[PDB]
Amino acid sequence: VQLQESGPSLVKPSQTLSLTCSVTGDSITNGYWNWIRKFPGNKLEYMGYISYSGSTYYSPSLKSRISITRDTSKNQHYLQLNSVTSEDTATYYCASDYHGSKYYFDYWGQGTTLTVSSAKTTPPSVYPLAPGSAAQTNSMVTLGCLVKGYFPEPVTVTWNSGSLSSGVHTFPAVLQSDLYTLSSSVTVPSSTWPSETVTCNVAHPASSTKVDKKIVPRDCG
Amino acid sequence: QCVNLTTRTQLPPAYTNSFTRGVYYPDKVFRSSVLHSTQDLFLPFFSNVTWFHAIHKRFDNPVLPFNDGVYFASTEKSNIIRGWIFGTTLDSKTQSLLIVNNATNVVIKVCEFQFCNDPFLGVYYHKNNKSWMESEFRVYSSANNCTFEYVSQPFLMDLEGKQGNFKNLREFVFKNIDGYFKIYSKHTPINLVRDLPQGFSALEPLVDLPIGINITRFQTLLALHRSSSGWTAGAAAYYVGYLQPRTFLLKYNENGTITDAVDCALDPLSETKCTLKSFTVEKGIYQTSNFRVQPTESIVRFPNITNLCPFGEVFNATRFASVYAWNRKRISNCVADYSVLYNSASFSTFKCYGVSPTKLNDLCFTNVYADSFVIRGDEVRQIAPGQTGKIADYNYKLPDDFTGCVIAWNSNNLDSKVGGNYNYLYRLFRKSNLKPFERDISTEIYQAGSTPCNGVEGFNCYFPLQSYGFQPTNGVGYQPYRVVVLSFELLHAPATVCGPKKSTNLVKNKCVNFNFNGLTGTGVLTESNKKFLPFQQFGRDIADTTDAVRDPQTLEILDITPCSFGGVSVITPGTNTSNQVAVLYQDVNCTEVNVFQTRAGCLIGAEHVNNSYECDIPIGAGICASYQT
Amino acid sequence: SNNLDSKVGGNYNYLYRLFRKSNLKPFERDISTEIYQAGSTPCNGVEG
Amino acid sequence: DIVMTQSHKFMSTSVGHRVSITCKASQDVGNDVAWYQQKPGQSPKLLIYWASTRHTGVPDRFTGSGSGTDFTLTISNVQSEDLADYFCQQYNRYPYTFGGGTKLEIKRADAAPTVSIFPPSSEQLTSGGASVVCFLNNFYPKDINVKWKIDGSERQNGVLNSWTDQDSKDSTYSMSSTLTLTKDEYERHNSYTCEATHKTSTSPIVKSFNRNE
């Protein structure tokens, strides 16, 4: 049975959270649907679950600020987490724990990262990173792709629509007081740049912003 | 400080024998023409000492311990030994002692010195105009928190480089007991080329340094001479010997100079002199000490593999009680092995609180109470102190200091049928909170309002014993878990199921240490042929000596034989002719201990001669020894 | 020592030692302020 | 509550060695011990169920044992594809409290990184921004010092450092040092220099550029 997570990635504090753990391939017949979050810093905590009988119980850290509903028609279930705080910013997952043919199994999905903050939505501004004209010559030329001023996390940054995968070093994001900052690097030979077309594709599904910045040698000497 | 020498060649520290070194004055008592026995840390004779020198490929400065006490003995010809570093961890975090000498004043300072990588001192520019003047100061980096400083009188020491034989002999005693460092010294000219001199010299103390600190490791500084990493050294020798709490016999002359010292833990000839307190050994057998075989290990024989606890009727039962009318079962007077309950691979819930399950083996409890009840899957986590829910506030509340366990198993094929299981009940409404170890079996109708209910349902009158729901169309984890909670506490009653050390250990025909129910001792368990009574447990001799026992849970007939013990008699003639001895142990055998069998023991050291001569020194049973050709 | 060490609002400047694994040795000062573990659970840094 | 305590948070394991991942929990869990395998950028998967049988699709190089509260996850034949995070868990009851995690580290020979400092583009200076990024790739170990030298002065405010995980192809590391500054600060300085201090060389890699071009 395939799993897929969906929902808004920006939840304001002291409001109602909404998610959708899509279950495709097999209907809810036997098994549970847990909820595991991932805090930044390799710390994990449990949230809750729901069954197909009508009995719901959650973690003792959350007394009554969490409710999970069910819907057997569209094979989907929502997650309502009321009165969220700044510590609830985590990557939410849904899984299932049920045995099969007298053997234990564990299925997982993809997961999405939800950012709980009071900041405003800012569209990203992609700026190119070109080397200097008096740099040292080398057979392998390093390029860059700078994304600064985007909210919220995460974003999808590729290289030449996924066709350029060799030498791609994905860098994580940092957190300043207002926005985020994403960086990336690639390794192309001297016969490729600037002879061929190198353009990093930056896509932001939260703000519907897609900026394709062509790597051009600006400015010249 | 940071620059280290690169001329270090790794050589193995071979063993070296010492003859009579390690003799000094024990205290401030001056004696003459007497023989007094002292008890202090001395160097044992014919022990194992180190082998290190200071040459221009072998340049070694090892790290030696100090908790047992060390002895210093060095033969010098050009004053190579400068000082030592008395520290604890060889770092700038603890308090250390640094005693060096730049041939002008004895620098004794008690500060917090910075331990460098490799301290070294030398003389520069040996080509022309040497003048024996030193300028390099690479012993330490800084010195703070100084509490004591000692400056000696200025003098002039000749540090010239002599060739040939040694001309100086400087020995030191480095020991520290109860925060009082004692330093001894002795200087005398000798004649020596390579080996260790077999001389005799008493060391006199110079000063007293009550540092009051702990010293664990130490090093030794060396002088360097070469005609900043390729510098070489000269030629010297120094030996380190570990001290032991032995006993010496200092022979004083008419002037008070120590002329002889005898270590009592070296040879059986010394055992005669340290007992009678006289070096002149006369004719006759003299008893010195008592031989005793030390035991190997401690063996306790309390439990066995039988007489287990009745856990079959508890874990493999059919039906249980509810959460409000649960039954309390007491388990005692047996032995419960916790290793077969962990690897059963059939318990879906095995939790324990309070203490670790690997730590309760060496821990004895007195009360075991199994609390079995049937709950759902959403009520197992509520069995915890300081929690709320439908169990901790309504049905069963744990105390604060609860150190019990939670044992349950799967009931997928036991309490799951098609149609619904309405067997067990649970209370839903209650006015007040609960108490630890409280059972509520009342079926009183809960009055939610002001009007009475009169035992029947009506306006604000609901049935408190709500029914459970067990259907095959429910979840997997909602099956009824047969939760059995164990209780443990400490009272005035003694322990029953603890286990002394283990199950069983059987080592025969050896001197082992047993442990019985009412008596302890050390003996050998040997075979026997008697027929004891089956209800007996022990047995005594005439004058109350345990010699034959019986295992309480194993029908065996074994006796208790004492180990090989007895006195030590040294057979030796007078010291005016020779010093050969004959080792004779009393009440021993020639198996457990030039071997001759005697009636008093095993005589090892004397040969068997069929020729009968005159009796000189008595041994026993008509056997005599004589020092003849 | 009430009129020499105590002040207004309470005195909360100095510290002392409360917990230890074993007993102290006679004539030895304990100035070790390092964080040591109790059993087999290491901490290695901040409190908690 | 169930406290899941591991041995260490960060360990090191070379290729061919045997690493014993121990998770000494304070409370006994029985035999319901499972372990995760979380790649950087993916979801954790099931590795060992019921502490005696491997999962379908997992090779035979992953073994597991333990007695009492002292479990041992013996990882034999540690290759580059086995570099993941491990979490001792239990399917006994809710909540599923997980451990801290143990990350391995493959040891190899030390090498020099590739330092390349790039000038800011002309499109960023139009809006009024300036960010000098000092790229550092293929360095070892993770502990490194990246400082900025602007006209002989060290700058602390405005430095954004973000390190990556260990790569599963060459066992190297990557990071990025972005110097966030204003537009007026860019016109008052000339030389920007970032250095990378390595343990195999006393002199760091000096990479600079001139604004006159």
CA of D124 vs chain C CAs: smallest distance (Å): 43
Resolution (A): 7.5
- Stretch (H or E) spanning A197: none
Q: Does D134 touch chain A (CB under 8 A)?
A: no
**Strand residue runs (E) in B13-82:** 16-17, 35-37, 40-42, 48-49, 52-53, 64-65, 70-76
CATH number at residue B25: 2.60.120.960
**Residue type for position C6:** S
Distance CA B228, CA B4 (A): 8
Asked if B251 has any chain D CB less than 8 Å from its own CB, the reply is no
SS3 of A168, please? coil
Residue B381: which of D29, D52, D93 has the nearest Cβ? D93
Q: Under a CB-based contact definition with an 8 Å cutoff, are residues A213 and A144 in contact?
A: no
- Residue B259 lies in domain: 15-290
Which helix or strand (DSSP H or E) is residue B144 part of?
strand B143-150
Smallest Cβ–Cβ distance between D96 and the set A46, A105, A142 belongs to A46
Angle (CA) A94-A98-A102 rounded to 5° is 155
Contacts D30 to B, Cβ<8 Å: 342, 347-351
Start-end of H helices in A66-221: none
A170: which chain D residues are within 8 Å (Cβ-Cβ)?
A: 41, 164
Whole-angstrom Cα distance, residue B571 to residue B607?
A: 13
Q: D78: which DSSP letter?
A: -
SS3 D126: helix
Non-local (6+) Cβ contacts of B574 within 8 A are B280, B281, B282, B283
Q: Tell me which of D115, D162, D177, D182 to substitute to probe the interface with A (most A C-beta atoms closer than 10 Å).
A: D162
C40 in contact with D at a CB cutoff of 8 Å? yes
When CB atoms are compared, the residue of D9, D124, D175 closest to A127 is D124
Q: Taking a C-beta distance cutoff of 8 angstroms, is the pair B323, B373 a contact?
A: yes
One-character DSSP codes across B93-134: TS--EEEEE-SSSEEEEEEEE---SS--EE----SS--TT--
Chain C to chain D, count of Cβ pairs less than 8 Å apart? 4
- Is the CB of B476 less than 8 angstroms away from the CB of A53? no
Contacts C41 to D, Cβ<8 Å: 5, 24, 26
Identify the experimental approach.
cryo-EM
Q: How far is CA A94 from the centre of its chain?
A: 15
User: Residue A147 has what DSSP assignment?
Assistant: E
- Give the separation between CA D196 and CA C6, rounded to whole angstroms: 55
- Residues D68, B350: C-beta atoms closer than 8 Å: no
Chains with 3+ CB–CB pairs under 8 A to A are B, D
Give the CA dihedral B523, B526, B529, B530, nearest 10 degrees. 20
Hey, of D27, D50, D96, which one would you mutate to test binding to chain B, going by the most B CBs within 10 A of its CB?
D27
**Three-state secondary structure along B267-320?**
CHHHHHHHHHCCCCCCCCCEEEEEEECCCCCECCCCCCCCCECCCHHHHCCCCC
Q: Residue B348 and residue D93: Cβ atoms within 8 Å?
A: no
**CB-CB under 8 Å, D160 with A97:** no
Residue D23 in contact with residue D5, Cβ under 8 Å?
yes
The residues in B 371-390 lying below 8 A from A, measured between CB atoms, are: 378, 381, 387
Chain D: closest CA distance from residue B435 (Å)? 22
Distance CA A3, CA A24 (A): 6
Distance CA(B241)–CA(B47), nearest Å, equals 8
CA nearest to B331, candidates B487, B517, B492, B553:
B487
CA distance B274 to B263: 8
Residues in chain D closer than 8 A to B349 (CB atoms): 30, 92-93
Residue D114 β-bridge partners: D137
**Other C-beta atoms within 10 Å of B367: how many?**
15
**Closest Cβ–Cβ partner in A53, A98, A99 for B478:** A53
Length of chain B: 629
Q: Answer for the pair B341, D31: CB distance below 8 angstroms, yes or no.
A: no
**Interface contact A218-D161, CB threshold 8 A:** no
On the question of a cis peptide bond just before residue A219, with omega within 30 degrees of 0, the verdict is yes
Residue length of chain D: 213
DSSP state of B236: -
* Burial category of A176 from C-beta neighbours within 10 Å (exposed 0-12, middle 13-18, buried 19 and up): exposed
Residue B397: C-alpha distances to residues A116, B267, B389, B427, B435 (Å) = 38, 73, 10, 13, 6
CB contact under 8 A, B476 and A30: yes
With an 8 Å Cβ cutoff, are D92 and B356 in contact?
no
Residue B237 near residue B75 (C-beta atoms within 8 A): yes
Closest by Cβ to B351, choosing from D28, D67, D68: D28
Neighbours of chain C (3+ CB pairs under 8 A): D
Alpha-carbon span A66 to A16, nearest angstrom: 9
Residues in chain A: 221
Sorted by sequence, the CB contacts under 8 Å of residue C10 that are 6+ apart come out as none
Cα–Cα distance between B365 and B368 in angstroms, integer?
8
Integer Cα distance of B304 and B313 in angstroms: 22
Burial of D175 (0-12, 13-18, 19+ CB in 10 A): buried
DSSP codes, B426-482? EE---SS---BT------PPEE-SSS--TTS-BTTEE-SEEEP---TTS-STTS-EE
In the chain, the amino acid numbered B277 is: K
Q: Which of B389, B407, B412 is nearest to B474 (CA)?
A: B412
Exposed e or buried b per residue across C4-42, where buried means at least 16 C-beta atoms within 10 angstroms of its C-beta: eeeeeeeeeeeeeeeeeeeeeeeeeeeeeeeeeeeeeee
One-letter identity of residue D9 = K
A15 CA: distance to closest CA in chain D (Å): 24
Question: Which residue in D9, D23, D24 has the most chain C C-beta atoms within 10 A of its own C-beta, making it the best mutation to test that interface?
Answer: D24
Backbone φ, ψ for residue B325 (5° rounding) = -120, 45
Enumerate chain A positions whose Cβ falls within 8 A of a Cβ in B: 30-32, 51-53, 55, 57, 60, 98-99
Which residues are within 8 A (CB) of B257 and not within 5 positions of it... i.e. 6 or more apart?
B202
Short-list A91, A146, A104, CA closest to D121: A146
Q: For residues A202 and A156, give the distance between their C-alpha atoms in angstroms, rounded to a whole number.
A: 6
Q: Do B358 and D68 touch (CB under 8 A)?
A: yes
Say whether A209 sits in a helix, a strand or coil: strand
Residue B489 to residues A163, B347, B354, B533, D28: CA-CA distances in angstroms? Answer: 69, 25, 11, 39, 19
Residue type at position B285: I
Distance, in Å, from the CA atom of B146 to the CA atom of B98, rounded to the nearest integer, reads 11
- Alpha-carbon Rg for chain B, nearest whole angstrom, is 40
CB–CB of A53 and B473 under 8 A? yes
Closest listed residue to residue B391, CA positions, set B326, B296, B343: B326
Q: Residues of A with CB below 8 A from B471's CB?
A: 53
Which residue, among A146, A128, A143, has the nearest Cα to A183 in the 3D structure? A146
CB A102 within 8 A of CB A35: no
Q: What share of chain C is helix, strand, coil (3-state, %, to 5)?
A: 0, 0, 100
Angstrom distance (rounded) from CA B373 to CA B423:
13
CB pair distance less than 8 Å for A132 and D119: yes
For residue C23, the Cα-to-chain-centroid distance in whole angstroms is 14
